[PDB]
Paper text:
The dipeptides with a C-terminal tryptophan (IW, VW, YW, RW) show an identical conformation of binding within the non-prime subsite, with the tryptophan residue occupying the S2 subsite. IW-1 isoleucine and VW-1 valine sit within the S1 subsite, forming a hydrophobic contact with Trp341. Due to the similarity of isoleucine and valine, the interactions within the S1′ subsite for VW-2 and IW-2 are conserved. Based on this, it is likely that the difference in the dipeptide affinities towards AnCE (IW: 0.08 mM, VW: 0.17 mM) is influenced by the difference in hydrophobicity, with a more hydrophobic side chain being favoured. The tryptophan binding within the S2′ subsite is conserved between IW-2, VW-2, YW-2, and RW-2, where the tryptophan side chain forms hydrophobic interactions with Phe441 and Tyr507, a π-stacking interaction with Phe511, and a H-bond with Gln266. The VW dipeptide has a slightly lower affinity for AnCE, with a Ki value of 117 µM; interestingly, VW also has a lower affinity for cACE when compared to IW, with a Ki value of 2.1 µM. Though VW has lower affinity for cACE and AnCE than IW, it shows higher selectivity when the affinities are compared to nACE, with VW having a Ki value of 151.6 µM compared to IW having a Ki value of 59.6 µM. The difference in affinity between IW and VW in AnCE is likely due to the extra carbon atom in isoleucine, which has an effect on the van der Waals interactions within both subsites, potentially further stabilising the dipeptide compared to VW. The changes within the S1 subsite could influence the more hydrophobic dipeptides IW-1 and VW-1, particularly due to the S1 subsite environment being less favourable for the isoleucine and valine. The S1′ and S2′ subsite changes between AnCE and cACE could result in higher affinity binding of the IW-2 and VW-2 dipeptides within these subsites due to the changes from AnCE-Thr364 and Gln266 to cACE-Val380 and Thr282, respectively, resulting in more hydrophobic pockets.
Angiotensin-I-converting enzyme (ACE, EC 3.4.15.1) is a promiscuous zinc metallopeptidase with a number of substrates, including the vasoregulatory peptides angiotensin I and bradykinin, the anti-fibrotic agent N-acetyl-SDKP, the neurotransmitter substance P, and amyloid-β peptide. Here, we present the use of the Drosophila melanogaster ACE homologue, AnCE (which, in particular, shares enzymatic properties with cACE), as a model to study the structural basis of ACE inhibition. The active site is located at the centre of this channel, marked by the location of the catalytic zinc ion, which is coordinated by His367, His371, and Glu395. The high-resolution crystal structures of AnCE in complex with the dipeptides VW, IW, YW, RW, and WR presented here reveal dual binding in both the non-prime (dipeptide-1) and prime (dipeptide-2) subsites of AnCE.
Numbering used by the authors: 19 to 614
Write the structure that this text describes.
Amino acid sequence: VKEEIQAKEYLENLNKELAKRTNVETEAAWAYGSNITDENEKKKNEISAELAKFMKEVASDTTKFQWRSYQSEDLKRQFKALTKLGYAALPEDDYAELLDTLSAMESNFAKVKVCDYKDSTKCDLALDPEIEEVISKSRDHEELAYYWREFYDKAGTAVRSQFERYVELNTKAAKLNNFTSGAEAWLDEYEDDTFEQQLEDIFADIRPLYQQIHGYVRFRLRKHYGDAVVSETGPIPMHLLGNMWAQQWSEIADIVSPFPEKPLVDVSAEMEKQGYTPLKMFQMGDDFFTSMNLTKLPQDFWDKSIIEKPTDGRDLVCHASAWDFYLIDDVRIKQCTRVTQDQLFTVHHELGHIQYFLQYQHQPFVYRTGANPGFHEAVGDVLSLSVSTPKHLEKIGLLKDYVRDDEARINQLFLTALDKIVFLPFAFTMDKYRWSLFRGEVDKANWNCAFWKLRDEYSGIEPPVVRSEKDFDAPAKYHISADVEYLRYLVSFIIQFQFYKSACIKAGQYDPDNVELPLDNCDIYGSAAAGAAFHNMLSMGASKPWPDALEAFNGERIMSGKAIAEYFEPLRVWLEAENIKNNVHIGWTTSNKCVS
Ligand SMILES: *[C@@H]1O[C@H](CO)[C@@H](O[C@@H]2O[C@H](CO)[C@@H](O[C@@H]3O[C@H](CO[C@H]4O[C@H](CO)[C@@H](O)[C@H](O)[C@@H]4O)[C@@H](O)[C@H](O[C@H]4O[C@H](CO[C@@H]5O[C@H](CO)[C@@H](O)[C@H](O)[C@@H]5O)[C@@H](O)[C@H](O)[C@@H]4O)[C@@H]3O)[C@H](O)[C@H]2NC(C)=O)[C@H](O)[C@H]1NC(C)=O
Ligand SMILES: *[C@@H]1O[C@H](CO)[C@@H](O)[C@H](O)[C@H]1NC(C)=O
Ligand SMILES: *[C@@H]1O[C@H](CO)[C@@H](O)[C@H](O)[C@H]1NC(C)=O
Ligand SMILES: [Zn+2]
């Protein structure tokens, strides 16, 4: 009708206004996140409250248009997105209380300090970097357990009453948008009613490999720590796995690697010896993208980013993140960067977000996000997969005197699995837990043990000490304290293998029927063929449902476990044999580390 013509002009104008108002909210959030004070908290929450109020006016104005009657799929999609208010649907007082609750949790988490194990006078150890360094480096099980407990008590238990209020307010918000719970609100971002089932099916296919890796790691840990510390048949004590949440185990690769007489890629020491800085690491990431004929970082990036931990003793959120300011070319990273191999991957991870932001900044505001949350998280990881290859690391002079025999290949495959397969059950449990609270499936009296129950069922790990319903451990993970959906990372770790396989084929770097070009040594550095595929997909933003974005990249429309399995198939074959040959116990008894 004539109405659809006016509507298109309504949208064009409203999109620009939302960008500009979001800009101002993002600036205040940035200011808080990079400098936590009471004054910046109030500024952030007051701006948010005002944007919330305007969003409600907008939702209500969508009803004045017959938008579901229109011809244009594109107009209807944009209107649909403006009806989805999220937390902004709350009454203004409930919204302000929710923001205050979220602030309390995120700043509790960011301000955690603990006492040194060897010196209880020295009480200024932060997660990043001091506690993370001990967890990743110490092989003293008693020190490890000490830091685990100190951290979980302060980051987790201390915000129980706040976490509860947040679940209530999150649930109320979802119901006001006519979702059953916050779980359905999160899942709506994947635009697919069978999405949970799809992930269950993929997870069930990779679980057997996970159990083989688990079994082997447990066997190797028993030889290091002995049977008093690690049982044969029980869940692995999580504090021994190189990471505070046992989400990835690559930091203990030096004690669990298949062939310890053969090389294991660890380039941290060479980075340090070649004088690498944070600045250099970001410049390398930048080079990687521009090498593929993708977009160079703008000057605002270099001028406004924070790529090193401030040295002025202020409080900030050190958890690494990427920020879109919704103008032109104002994109930033906040990373407390350290010169290590894992941090090099993180740098590429974060720069994948930046690239996505630049690729879609010509889109209308509602379309300036990922095709789905998982797509956003995968982009940088596709590059990190290349960066991590011995091929790439020899090219940039970080890996010296490396012979890629069959045993070094198994070592590298295993190292990657400790980051990529191990994480899958972990990532699944973070949202399974929250979903189950959001949906009202667990009584408040059982919330802590329901967490550790899932961590046992899916990952076969447990706490180093007995916990109970007096503790509350979930918020000790950043994203749980900060209310960041975690499924995006599960989706990412599956789909990034679909992107990488396809990028590798396009780059001439992978042929199944040619042993010179195996998937696990593919480097896509310099490939404009791969870059083109990325451009086609990333530039779409959220303008189409995600199957359409994937189709733009490689012609497929389906999320699949095929690629991640193909990548690790040589590992699976070897590891199955090695477990049988060493009579390794697979599976685990129920944990008894959480008392009701
Ligand atoms: C979540 O789900 C909620 C339901 O569970 C839903 O809430 C409902 O939304 C309806 C509109 O979205 C709303 O409808 C209005 O009802 C008015 C009368 O209802 C009152 O009495 C109820 C008991 O009987 C009370 O419980 C309520 O609290 C109400 O106070 C009507 O006056 C009103 O009507 C007018 O509006 C229609 C709209 O027509 C549409 O648009 C054009 C009009 O420009 C039409 O040409 C077109 O065909 C189309 O129909 C007009 O026909 C005309 O002006 C009417 O007079 C309207 O029906 C309903 O009251 C409300 N609550 C409940 C519980 O029913 C939420 O909307 C959902 N939330 C989200 C985010 O989607
Ligand atoms: C942190 O924020 C305060 C406002 O609460 C401001 O005055 C101060 O300059 C900021 N500090 C830094 C280092 O930016
Ligand atoms: C970069 O992009 C151009 C135009 O968009 C494309 O045609 C070309 O393949 C790319 N250039 C290089 C360096 O390969
Ligand atoms: Zn990310």
